Amino acid sequence: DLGKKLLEAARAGQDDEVRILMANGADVNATDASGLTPLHLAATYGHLEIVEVLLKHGADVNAIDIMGSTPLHLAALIGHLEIVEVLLKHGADVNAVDTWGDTPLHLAAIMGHLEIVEVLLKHGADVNAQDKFGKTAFDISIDNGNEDLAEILQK
Amino acid sequence: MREIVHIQAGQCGNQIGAKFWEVISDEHGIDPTGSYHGDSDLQLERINVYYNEAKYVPRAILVDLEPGTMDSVRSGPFGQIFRPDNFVFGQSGAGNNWAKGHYTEGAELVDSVLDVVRKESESCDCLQGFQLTHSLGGGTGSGMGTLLISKIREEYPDRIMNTFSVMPSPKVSDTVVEPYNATLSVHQLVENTDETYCIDNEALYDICFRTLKLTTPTYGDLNHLVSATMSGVTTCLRFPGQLNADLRKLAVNMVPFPRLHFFMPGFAPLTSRLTVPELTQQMFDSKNMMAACDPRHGRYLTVAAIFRGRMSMKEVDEQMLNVQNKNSSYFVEWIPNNVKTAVCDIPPRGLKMSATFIGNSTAIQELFKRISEQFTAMFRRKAFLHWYTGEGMDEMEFTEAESNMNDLVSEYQQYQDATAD
Amino acid sequence: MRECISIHVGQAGVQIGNACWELYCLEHGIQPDGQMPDSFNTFFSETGAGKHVPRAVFVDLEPTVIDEVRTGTYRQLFHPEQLITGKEDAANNYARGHYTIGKEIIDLVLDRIRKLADQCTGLQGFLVFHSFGGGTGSGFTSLLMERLSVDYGKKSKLEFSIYPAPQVSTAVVEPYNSILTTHTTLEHSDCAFMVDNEAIYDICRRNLDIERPTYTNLNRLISQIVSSITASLRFDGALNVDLTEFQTNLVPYPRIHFPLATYAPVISAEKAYHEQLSVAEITNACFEPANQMVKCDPRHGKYMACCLLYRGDVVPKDVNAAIATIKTKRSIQFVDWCPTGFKVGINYQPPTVVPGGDLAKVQRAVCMLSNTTAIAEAWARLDHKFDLMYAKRAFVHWYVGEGMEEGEFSEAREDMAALEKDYEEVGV
């Protein structure tokens, strides 16, 4: 199965194997058991060139896994700035909501990825979006005393 | 109660450990070759607490899975003072992986470390216990440091186990596995240590950036705050005195509940590389805390305040009674006379006046909740779990570590809301 | 003789002991090496070479305090084998003092006490000096008192106990240690003289003009009071001639055995030409709360016994006139089952002050020992602090992990509750 091999090559950052597998008909939108696609894995593991290749060849930028995570949620969680930017350039839903009520903004805020927070806000992140506990990214910043983040969130 | 055995593990542990030895050596008049060249009898009275008499040699064990840290410490100002046989180092590091530190690389080196600990402990007349310096965010200090804690506690159950544990923050490193490493470690610290000083990189960064106006703080800037704090909190162990003079009396005064043994240290004045009322108010200010928690968001269970330098004891007593009477609502009413004060005549390097605060505050739950929120954000998406599970670890250890830290938070909240009635 | 053995346990016990023996030596003309150019034979043995040695034992679980005795002015006064030390102290934990650390030196201490007891032809018993707050002072004392009750069944045991004050405390758990030792020692002690460190601190500040009293200041004042109480034993007195008579005169029932000491006059050494107070004046000063060794209010309580111990230039008829004045004062109420009276002892030697001391030499002094129900207020204060912490089980884990069962906290507390009832039933 080329789908499983593509998922592993996207995760491992194997650029030439991703290229050979796709040339042999590998499903760009293959899913693992939890619904993660090669784009989710490349975004999680920081492989910018594979993210770009997949998006050039029909990858769904807004694909969701079983927990509602989009590639943008995972690039925002892990802190891959260039990937967040490529994903948004290719139509990533800035306000996608997962099964915990989290948006990419909540995840970048929790993990202290301040530059990513700024980019998400510039691209229309919803400051009023509440997680399943009623918290916005601004509530997270006040509740955890992150003053640099609270300032950024208020521009 | 005389000898303390110091262990420093991993990059952070060794860096803060080397600075600790440089700072207390200058206070005790010990030069980089182990010779005493001081001019006060109080410097040598309790030197046996931290030094073996060969010439004075630190009762220190230096551990790392990365060899580079051997050279770094030896190249330092007091690098050649340490016993060469007390450097226990590996070849392949832990790569910021708690599982590599606790189960694989670390498990392979731990017996060589325990051999050295045993040799240092059998030569002690009356061993008080152990002091470990480490970070919780990496792999060695966190994973191997907690393995060392577990093995020392089972071999020396009657000894005090004390740690100087540096907490990760996205502001200083920002490697997203740090919350995992730290949560897995707090789990171990709750059960196997008697006392832990919480040295929060979030607080150290904020002090340097906001108070000291250092635009880009370095580890040297952060470590200057750490070394001043470590000197301050160990003053009562190193010089003659009657309050918290050893690790056990400190624990008995500071720890009402065995798991709530995480202290918020504070220091005044804060400086980059002062009257009694100023020292007293600054000591208790949130801006002077080395843990990123607002004390006015919780309540003090117990407090130790150490003043250093020549000053009026009646002024110190009046200012200390004033803070308790003024701010009565921040000290639990069900622990009477829970604030103890000491005054050491010898001041720290470059200052005439100084004050160190050690608080056992319920507000420390803010630190644990911050780590917990990051742990949970990562763990819910199962991000990089394979890196841990492929190094002799199970996924249920993550859920148990998460559950133990949230129970720790709940226990603090219980005592924050408790009333004498 | 009719010998008495003094036992000093823990830092407070040892340091107060140092001040007491220093004062006794000066009162009896003994030099710090035991030589002199007798009534005091009750407290000192005599060697073949004319050396007068205290019938005293000093015990501590760590060596620092007793090491100072071994190298100081009185390095040659005591039998060196009667200065006994362990290595690791009780860490402000009654349980370590009584169980895990104390059990390591208890047999040595008893064997060394036996050596002193074997030199006695008519041992009266023991005077035990200790803090309530320390781990050793609390736990080791109670262990020792239990063992002395088994080993010396017919001998009297008197205590000098330091009651804790927040002004000089080094531990948050001193209320626990206080109550645990009080519970376990109560059946083994015949009479106990409590000294409230806050009362002594206030006297030093208000009468001696010492802004920040040291333990040396507190201890020289305490030793003056202890000397007043023990003078009858050391000067062949007619009142309180032996240890049994302290119980007869001050303790009508075994459990309510805590007499209040009041001492006057306390005058600063800088007032070397103060006009001397009369017997009437110093006797009136015994009913002023400022002169009490324990903070409490005897005007609200009732007296079960009262004894006045005078020192110096005191004419018996002047004492009798001063007592008749005191007997016509509405604020002094005796229980209806005791003879409404005052026992008198007079020692005619001038009160002694130590060179290095803070007190002026006076021509006449008095120590009143009164068994008043007002002292129950000191137990109520300790019991209140105990209850605040124990309700949350604060610090209890330190005790349970050092050979003590949790049930001992509540057993000790209920015995304190029974003690508060004993006082309430005696006087209302």
Ligand SMILES: Nc1nc2c(ncn2[C@@H]2O[C@H](COP(=O)(O)OP(=O)(O)OP(=O)(O)O)[C@@H](O)[C@H]2O)c(=O)[nH]1
């Ligand atoms: N008056 C007086 N009180 C003292 C002295 N030393 C200590 N204290 C008091 O005694 C209590 C502390 O107990 P310590 O006697 O020092 O302790 P310890 O018996 O040696 O027991 P550990 O040290 O716990 O083994 C506190 O209430 C102190 O204020 C002293 O010399 N004089």
Ligand SMILES: Nc1nc2c(ncn2[C@@H]2O[C@H](COP(=O)(O)OP(=O)(O)O)[C@@H](O)[C@H]2O)c(=O)[nH]1
């Ligand atoms: N304050 C401080 N933090 C440090 C220092 N070195 C590393 N850290 C922190 O320690 C964590 C990384 O662990 P580290 O000690 O480098 O890894 P180890 O060698 O595997 O134990 C991160 O949270 C770093 O910010 C240091 O010198 N001072």
Ligand SMILES: [Mg+2]
């Ligand atoms: Mg002691």
